[PDB]
Paper text:
Structural studies revealed that PfEMP1 molecules present a helix-kinked-helix motif that forms the core of the EPCR-binding site. Binding of PfEMP1 prevents EPCR from binding to its natural ligand, protein C, thereby preventing PAR1-mediated endothelial signaling, most likely resulting in inflammation and endothelial dysfunction.
The starting model for the designed immunogen contained residues N648 to K678 from the HB3var03 CIDRα1.4 domain inserted in between residues Gly70 and Asp103 of the three-helical bundle. We selected three sites in design 469 at which residues were predicted to be found at an appropriate distance to allow disulfide bond formation. These residues were replaced with cysteine to form three mutants, cys1, cys2, and cys3, each of which had a single disulfide bond. The cys2 variant was most effective, retaining α-helicity at up to 70°C in circular dichroism measurements and interacting with EPCR with a slow off-rate, reminiscent of the CIDRα1-EPCR interaction. As determined by surface plasmon resonance, the cys2 variant bound to EPCR with an affinity of 26 nM, which compares well with 220 nM for the D576A K642A mutant of this domain, which shares the same number of EPCR-binding residues as cys2. We next determined the crystal structure of the synthetic binder in complex with EPCR. Crystals formed and a complete data set was collected to 3.11 Å resolution. A structural alignment revealed the EPCR-binding site to adopt an extremely similar conformation to that predicted, with the residues of the helix-kinked-helix motif of the synthetic binder (N72-W93) overlaying with the design with a RMSD of 1.19 Å. The structure also revealed that the synthetic binder bound to EPCR with the same binding mode as the HB3var03 CIDRα1 domain.
Author numbering:
A (entry chain B): 9 to 177
B (entry chain A): 1 to 34, 47 to 119
Write the structure that this text describes.
């Protein structure tokens, strides 16, 4: 079946964000995320992962949230963002009944409207907006600039996420 | 100049945790140049490891936050950011070895 993740980031200003999110494995809620930039707390509702494994998963997730906020700050200092704003990140992996060819995704919405999405075939981010703006071109420029935002993001989706589905259904 | 300011903050943390690590190394040298003192070793092993972890987490948090500011500078890149991050991680580790060594010797 599948692993879907939702992340909602509330920016009052460039310096501070409030996170709210959840994850659902095979249609069941499994994880919850809540808190501000400094103290964002991530908990698993079921003991799917052993304490050591889960601690490594949290380290990874917590590093992502620092990095994510950093990118928002850069886009703002370079192209100026209009605050307050809300960023929705909907991502996951879906496994077929037969075959290993898994469908994977990462769609980003800003203030309820489509913004950018990841395309795993070439590990490149694309615009989901009809509007041509400095913010969209710059964000995509940065997103397609690094191995972190490209092959590492794809590896999370195609390997980390998929393996989790295979292990914990 | 954003990243310039942020490197200064990274430096401060390391410089603080360095002087905190030597505050402990001198405690471990005054107790070896001397059973109960042997527990003064567990208390030094504990305070030293707890200190390391804090130092390692606060500094990594700094690096992860300055991912795009440092790599967007132009004469710094992903490889060099990951290089610098490990260069600092191993700088902290080194001090723990300095302390632990004293204890293991005095054993
Ligand atoms: C199977 C997973 C584990 C099971 C647990 C499930 C999760 C439990 C928590 C529930 C809540 C879920 C919500 C969190 C969202 C997803 C977080 C994961 C993202 C992540 O770590 O991806 C890394 C990439 O990060 C980066 O690339 C960092 C930079 C940030 C990119 C931002 C992308 C959107 C751009 C829009 C922002 C700009 C705004 C402009 C107006 C990959 O790394 P990995 O190390 O994990 O890889 C493994 C290979 N070793
Ligand atoms: C993870 O947290 C989510 C918080 O946003 C939430 O998922 C969905 O979020 C949207 C808000 O953007 C809401 O969607 C709509 O749901 C019903 C349709 O059934 C509408 O009548 C509502 O007016 C609302 O706009 C909901 O809050 C929620 N969606 C649903 C279907 O409940 C969930 O709490 C978490 N995700 C899951 C899948 O449980
Ligand atoms: C994301 O959604 C936000 C909520 O809809 C929106 O915030 C609102 O932003 C505008 C402009 O920055 C603020 O209004 C200002 O502009 C009008 C123009 O006629 C002036 O008359 C007002 O005096 C005022 O200065 C709103 O105050 C602000 N809303 C809140 C709750 O503060 C963001 O702009 C949206 N951001 C993006 C990037 O789309
Ligand atoms: C940890 O983060 C939060 C907010 O800064 C603090 O703890 C609580 O965590 C919940 C998470 O849902 C918050 O909504 C609450 O506002 C917090 N307080 C209570 C009474 O529940 C906590 O103080 C932070 N810790 C540190 C050390 O800063």
């Amino acid at each position: 079946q599948r692993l879907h993740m939702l992340q909602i980031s509330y920016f009052r200003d460039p310096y501070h964000v409030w996170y709210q999110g959840n994850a659902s494995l095979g249609g069941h809620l499994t994880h919850v995320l809540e808190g501000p930039d400094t103290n964002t707390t991530i908990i698993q509702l079921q003991p799917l992962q052993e304490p050591e494994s889960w601690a490594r998963t949290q380290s990874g997730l917590q590093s992502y949230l620092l990095q994510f906020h950093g990118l928002v700050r850069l886009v703002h200092q370079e192209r100026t963002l209009a605050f307050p704003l809300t960023i929705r990140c909907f991502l996951g992996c879906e496994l077929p009944p037969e075959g290993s060819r898994a469908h994977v995704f990462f769609e980003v919405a800003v203030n309820g409207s489509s913004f950018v999405s990841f395309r795993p075939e070439r590990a490149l981010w694309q615009a989901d907006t009809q509007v041509t703006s400095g913010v969209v071109t710059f964000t995509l420029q940065q997103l397609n600039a690094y191995n972190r935002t490209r092959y590492e993001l794809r590896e999370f989706l195609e390997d980390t996420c998929v393996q989790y589905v295979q292990k914990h259904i | 100049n954003n990243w310039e300011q942020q490197k200064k903050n990274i430096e401060d943390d390391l410089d603080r945790y360095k002087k905190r690590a030597e505050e402990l190394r001198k405690e471990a040298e005054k107790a070896r140049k001397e059973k109960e003192w042997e527990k003064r070793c567990k208390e030094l092993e504990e305070r030293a490891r707890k200190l390391e972890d804090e130092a390692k987490d606060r500094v990594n948090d700094l690096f992860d936050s300055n991912f795009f500011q440092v790599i967007y500078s132009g004469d710094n890149d992903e490889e060099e950011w990951k290089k610098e991050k490990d260069r600092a991680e191993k700088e902290i580790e080194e001090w723990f070895k300095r302390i632990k060594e004293k204890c293991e010797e005095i054993k």
